[PDB]
Paper text:
conserved and function as secondary active transporters. transport proteins that include the amino acid transporter LeuT18. μM range and that metal ion transport is coupled to the cotransport of protons. of the prokaryotic SLC11 transporter EcoDMT.
mutants of Glu129 and reduced to half in H236A. different role in proton-coupled metal ion transport. does not function as primary H+-acceptor. the pKa of Glu129 would have to be shifted upwards. in vicinity to the metal ion coordinating Asp51.
Residue numbers in the entry: 13 to 506
The structure:
C-alpha cells in the first residue's frame, strides 16, 4: 500500500552530525533522477544551439537546470515528508478516471523517453559494432535480461552504477573539450544571464535566440522524473517524528539532487561548447546521431589540428557512440521504476519488472521498426533523419503530461493539509514555483500546436494545416479542462 514497497525506507544512516558520510549513504536518488536529464533527446539541440549562438545560450541552460532543481526538490519533499509518492497523493486527492488519464499520459511520456533511448542505443550499436540498423533495435529489446541482472544488484550499487554512466557520458564529452582547448573566457561570458538570448534578430539556421532559449526553458523538467524523485526519496528510512531529523533529511536529499542535476547541467554545457569549439561554424548539417558521428569523424569539420588527427584516427565518433549507449541504458532503470510508481499509484496495478519492461520496450520499438521499415523500403535513404524526426516527434507526450505533474505537485506541497504548517513551502518558493509552473505550462501549450503541425513534416499541405490547427486547439483546450478540473479537486482538498 506504500510506494516502492521493495526498497522503501531501506537504509537510514544518519549518525549524529557526521554529515558528509551520511551524504555518501543516500546520494543515489539524485543521480537516478539526473541521469534522465542527459538523454540524447536534446543533445543535437544543444550542439545546434552552440553553432547558431556561440556560448550565448549557456546561461539559459543554467536557468533551466535551476528550475529543474526547484520542482524536483519539491517532489523529493513530498516523498520525504508524506512518505508517499506524487502519484499516490494525486490519486488520493482525485477520482479514479483522472488518475487513469494521468496514468496513460505519464505512460506515454516515459514511452517517449524510451523511444529516444532505443533510437539512440540502436544507432549506437550501428556505429560501434556496425550492427545492421534493423538488428540493433531488436537487440535493444533484449534489455529485459539486463533488467533481470539489474534487479539482484541493490540500490547501493545500482545508484552508483547510474553515477558510473553519468561520468561516462560526462568524461566522454569533457575529453573532446579538453582536446579542443576552447576560449573559457567567452564561456564564462556566456554563462551570465544576458539579454541577447531573449532577442529575435540573429536568426541563424532558422532559429532566433528567443526561440532556442524558450525551447530550453520549455523542456525544463521531465514529468516522470518527478514521480521518480518522490518515490526514490522515500528509500531512506525516516522516523517522521523529529522535526530536526526530517528537516535534516530535506537538506540531505536537496544537496544530493543539486549535486547531480548540477552534473547534468555540466553535460548540457559540454554539449553546447561541444557545438561551439569542437565543430566548425555550421559544420553540423545533420542533427542525427549518425550525422554527428560522421561529423566527429571528418577532420575538415573540427577547428583544431589535434582534433583533425584524432578525428581521422576515429576516436571522437566512437566515444560519441559510447555516450549514446550509456545514455540509452537509463530508461531501462528509471522507466521501469517510474512506470511501477505511476502504475501501482494511479490505477493500483501490481505488475512485475518482467512484463513492465517487456510491454514498454515493445510499444516503444513498434514505431521505430515501422520507421526503419519505411525508410529502408525507400532504400535506407534518410533513415537516420527519419529516426531523428521520430525521436523529436515523440517528445509531445511530455508536453501533454507536464502540467498534470507540476501543478498538482506545487499545489499539494504548498497546502498545509499535505505538508503541515511546519514543512510547507516558503513564501519564496511559492512565488518562484508558481512563476515557473505558469511559464512551463504556457510554453508547453504553445509547443502542442508546433509539434502537432510538425507531425505532417516540412511539407505544409494546405488542407492538412487547417486540420492541424483544429486538432491543436482541441488538444490544448482539453488540457485546459483537465487542468481546471484537477485545480478544482486539489483546491477542494485544501
Amino acid at each position: 500500500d506504500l510506494s516502492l514497497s521493495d526498497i522503501n525506507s531501506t537504509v537510514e544512516v544518519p549518525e549524529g552530525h557526521s554529515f558528509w558520510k551520511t551524504l555518501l549513504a543516500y546520494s543515489g536518488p539524485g543521480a537516478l533522477v539526473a541521469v534522465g536529464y542527459m538523454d540524447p533527446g536534446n543533445w543535437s539541440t544543444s550542439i545546434t544551439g552552440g553553432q547558431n549562438f556561440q556560448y550565448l545560450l549557456l546561461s539559459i541552460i543554467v536557468i533551466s537546470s535551476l528550475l529543474a532543481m526547484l520542482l524536483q526538490n519539491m517532489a523529493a519533499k513530498l516523498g520525504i515528508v508524506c512518505q508517499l509518492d506524487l502519484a499516490q497523493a494525486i490519486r488520493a486527492r482525485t477520482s479514479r478516471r483522472l488518475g487513469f488519464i494521468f496514468w496513460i499520459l505519464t505512460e506515454l511520456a516515459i514511452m517517449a523517453t524510451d523511444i529516444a533511448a532505443v533510437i539512440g542505443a540502436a544507432i549506437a550499436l550501428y556505429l560501434l559494432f556496425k550492427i545492421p540498423i534493423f538488428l540493433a533495435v531488436v537487440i535493444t529489446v533484449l534489455d529485459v535480461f539486463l533488467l533481470l541482472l539489474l534487479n539482484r544488484i541493490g540500490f547501493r550499487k545500482i545508484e552508483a552504477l547510474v553515477v558510473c554512466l553519468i561520468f561516462v557520458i560526462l568524461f566522454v564529452f569533457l575529453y573532446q573539450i579538453i582536446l579542443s582547448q576552447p576560449a573559457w573566457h567567452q564561456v564564462a561570458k556566456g554563462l551570465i544571464p544576458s539579454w541577447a538570448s531573449v532577442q529575435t534578430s540573429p536568426k541563424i539556421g532558422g532559429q532566433t535566440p528567443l526561440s532556442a532559449s524558450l525551447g530550453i526553458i520549455g523542456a525544463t523538467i521531465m514529468p516522470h522524473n518527478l514521480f521518480l524523485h518522490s518515490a526514490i526519496s522515500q528509500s531512506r528510512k525516516i522516523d517522521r517524528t523529529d522535526s530536526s531529523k526530517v528537516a535534516e533529511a530535506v537538506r540531505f536529499s536537496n544537496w544530493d539532487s543539486n549535486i547531480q542535476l548540477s552534473l547534468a547541467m555540466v553535460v548540457n554545457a559540454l554539449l553546447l561548447i561541444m557545438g561551439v569549439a569542437v565543430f566548425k561554424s555550421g559544420a553540423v548539417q545533420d542533427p542525427s546521431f549518425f550525422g554527428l558521428y560522421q561529423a566527429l569523424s571528418n577532420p575538415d569539420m573540427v577547428s583544431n589540428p589535434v582534433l583533425a588527427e584524432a578525428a581521422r584516427s576515429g576516436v571522437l565518433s566512437t566515444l560519441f557512440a559510447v555516450a549514446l549507449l550509456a545514455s540509452g541504458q537509463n530508461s531501462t532503470i528509471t522507466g521501469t521504476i517510474t512506470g511501477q510508481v505511476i502504475m501501482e499509484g494511479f490505477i493500483h496495478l501490481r505488475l512485475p519488472l518482467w512484463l513492465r519492461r517487456l510491454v514498454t520496450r515493445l510499444i516503444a520499438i513498434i514505431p521505430v521498426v515501422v520507421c526503419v521499415a519505411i525508410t529502408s523500403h525507400q532504400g535506407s535513404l534518410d533513415e537516420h533523419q527519419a529516426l531523428n524526426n521520430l525521436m523529436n516527434n515523440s517528445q509531445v507526450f511530455l508536453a501533454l503530461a507536464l502540467p498534470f505533474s507540476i501543478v498538482p505537485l506545487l499545489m499539494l506541497t504548498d497546502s498545509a493539509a499535505q505538508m503541515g504548517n511546519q514543512f510547507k513551502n516558503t513564501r519564496w518558493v511559492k512565488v518562484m514555483g508558481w512563476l515557473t509552473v505558469i511559464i512551463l505550462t504556457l510554453l508547453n501549450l504553445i509547443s502542442i500546436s508546433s509539434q502537432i503541425a510538425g507531425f505532417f513534416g516540412d511539407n505544409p499541405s494546405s488542407q492538412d494545416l487547417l486540420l492541424s490547427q483544429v486538432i491543436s486547439i482541441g488538444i490544448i483546450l482539453a488540457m485546459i479542462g483537465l487542468l481546471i478540473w484537477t485545480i478544482i479537486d486539489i483546491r477542494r482538498f485544501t
